[PDB]
Amino acid sequence: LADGAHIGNYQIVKTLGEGSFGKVKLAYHTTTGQKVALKIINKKGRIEREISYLRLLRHPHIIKLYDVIEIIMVIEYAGNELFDYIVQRDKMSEQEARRFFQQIISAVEYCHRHKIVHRDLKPENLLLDEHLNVKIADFGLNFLKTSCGSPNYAAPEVISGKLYAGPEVDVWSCGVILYVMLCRRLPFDDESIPVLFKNISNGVYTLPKFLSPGAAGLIKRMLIVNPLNRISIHEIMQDDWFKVDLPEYLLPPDL
Amino acid sequence: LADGAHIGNYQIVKTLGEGSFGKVKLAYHTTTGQKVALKIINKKGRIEREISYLRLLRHPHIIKLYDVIEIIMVIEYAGNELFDYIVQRDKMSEQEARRFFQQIISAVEYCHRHKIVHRDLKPENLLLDEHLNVKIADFGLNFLKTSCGSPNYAAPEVISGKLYAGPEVDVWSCGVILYVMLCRRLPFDDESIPVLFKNISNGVYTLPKFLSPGAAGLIKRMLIVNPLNRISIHEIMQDDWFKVDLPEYLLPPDL
């Protein structure tokens, strides 16, 4: 039950995080040795509905909810972080960046379809598995992780704490994300908190010249202050720059 | 010169981060095999004065600037993060927490003496070495790390972007830090950015009952909104709760 060991095919390894109910512990499947993530819960509503609803969501690049076993969740485990891999390789190609951006955007499209807005797309939520596939965590309706997002990646609507943050906020975050993989620098960022918020609020940032007309073009339409003029996920998936070398499994049925 | 290898006793291993001039690369000393951190620079003022000034600062718990070798810096390397270690051991003792808090506070006292205010004390800056000693990084006058601080740990003066942030801001951050090691939860923290800032601004937080009168007492005086009434580092070092089991090497000469 504790960091000791064993629970129906799974042996516990070492708590990964704590959180209001139980903890999250690393564990490896008894026979296969597949690493897994065990989120424990109990001692309390429509959460069970949620947990049940998550076991249905499946996507190559979203951390999967393998199966529920107190209340053990059994989640897919990815140990590395997308950006740790990116800093490693000095200057990865624009085509290398795009490859990741496509997996991410596809994943977002997938969730928005199932009516789930992430709202917290940031580096600590972009993981990678042994095959270099992105795995987005924290998707679906602890002190190691803060409840409020990393400002540098939040849309104006979020910085300003608007009562409604629609799927357009994910596009903005993805905008920042794309920007950083290509420019290796944050779009908005100042040592002064208030100034960082000012810039984000007025979409104040500069696009580096080494950016292809394609990339810079897409970034531009994603980082738009007015939620209504911000480009949509589907428009992004139909973009020429985006489309290049786009793996078929990433394109939904309707597109 | 690159991620290839070798530079006067040091062999390069794999870039740890990038930053406006050069990068930071992990390297191990050719003979001893001591891991080191290599920050590269060139292509430009009073920085050299600064670099020179840092080579003089020495403290058991501050990342040391071993020696300058373009412009290679050679920094002490710590791979783990204080809080990763803390989540591991389920509930570490109050005396275990205090041990870390003393090393941290001593380190801060040390820098404030040499007229250096950190201003960005957060989890990603609290490292640990193989002996479980804290090593504070980013001390002394990149996309993996943002320029603005992690709000949850910043003092009101910092959240509000006041033109002057004195050493009192470090006390506040240390307050949050102490709080989290003991309560395993953030003092101020809300999914709403504006609300998080409101709470911080009005020092709105609750002290858990399982806190000793000592600990809770110290926290209280650190998280004070008015910079002038906030407890001082030296008063903290003379506190009864703080003093318990305080290793002699951590106490400065004058105390």
- What CATH number did the domain enclosing A13 receive? 3.30.200.20
CB contact under 8 A, A148 and B194: no
Q: Do residues B33 and B123 both lie within one domain?
A: no
Domain termination site, one of A77, A107, A137: A77
Whether residue B143 is annotated as binding a ligand: the answer is no
Within 8 A by CB and 6+ apart from B38, the residues are B7, B10, B12, B24, B25, B26, B27, B72, B73, B74, B75
Q: Catalytic annotation on A84? A: no
Resolution in Å, one decimal place: 2.8
Q: To probe the interface with B, which of A185, A193, A196, A201 has the most B CB atoms within 10 Å?
A: A193
CB contact under 8 A, B123 and A144: yes
Q: Do residues A130 and A50 both lie within one domain?
A: no
Whether residue B20 is annotated as binding a ligand: the answer is yes
Number of compact structural domains in chain B: 2
Radius of gyration over every alpha carbon of chain A, rounded to an integer in angstroms: 19
Q: Other C-beta atoms within 10 Å of A100: how many?
A: 22
Q: To probe the interface with B, which of A81, A142, A143, A190 has the most B CB atoms within 10 Å?
A: A143
Q: Is the Cβ–Cβ distance between A170 and A153 less than 8 Å?
A: no
| CATH code for position B141 | 1.10.510.10
B 199-218: CB under 8 A from A: none
Separation CA B155–CA A77 (nearest Å): 35
Q: Do residues B88 and B29 both lie within one domain?
A: no
CB contact under 8 A, A148 and B192: yes
Q: Do residues B95 and B126 both lie within one domain?
A: yes
Nearest to residue A129, comparing CAs of A243, A36, A66?
A36
Q: Do residues B198 and B102 both lie within one domain?
A: yes
Whether residue A235 is annotated as binding a ligand: the answer is no
Domain termination site, one of A37, A54, A77: A77
Instruction: Point out the catalytic residue in the list A3, A120, A190, A254.
Output: A120
In the three-class reduction of DSSP (H, G, I as helix; E, B as strand; rest coil), residue B112 is classed as helix
Separation CA A136–CA B198 (nearest Å): 30
The DSSP code for B230 is S
Separation CA A33–CA B233 (nearest Å): 49
Give the chain B residue nearest A165 (alpha carbons).
B192
CB contact under 8 A, A151 and B147: no
Separation CA B221–CA B238 (nearest Å): 13
Domain termination site, one of A25, A48, A77: A77
Q: Is the Cβ–Cβ distance between A249 and A105 less than 8 Å?
A: no
Domain that holds residue A124: 78-255
Q: In chain A, what residues touch B153 (CB-CB under 8 Å)? A: none
Q: How far is A130 from chain B (nearest CA, A)?
A: 18
Q: Do residues B124 and B153 both lie within one domain?
A: yes
Q: List phi, psi (to 5°) of A248.
A: -60, -35
Whether residue B22 is annotated as binding a ligand: the answer is yes
Within 8 A by CB and 6+ apart from B4, the residues are B12
Residue count of chain B:
255
Q: Other C-beta atoms within 10 Å of A145: how many?
A: 14
Q: Do residues A122 and A242 both lie within one domain?
A: yes
- E strand intervals along chain A: 10-19, 22-29, 35-41, 71-72, 75-76, 80-81, 126-128, 134-136
B3 touches chain A (CB under 8 A): yes
Tell me the two tokens of residue B179. 């709080």
Tell me the two tokens of residue B36. 């080191």
Q: In chain B, what residues touch A195 (CB-CB under 8 Å)? A: 161
B50 touches chain A (CB under 8 A): no
B103 vs A51, A185, B100, B136, CA distance in Å? 42, 33, 5, 10
Chain-centre distance for alpha carbon B159: 18
Separation CA B243–CA B245 (nearest Å): 6
Tell me the two tokens of residue A1. 């039950």
Separation CA A232–CA A112 (nearest Å): 11
Q: Do residues A72 and A115 both lie within one domain?
A: no
Q: Do residues A93 and A151 both lie within one domain?
A: yes
Q: Do residues B113 and B52 both lie within one domain?
A: no
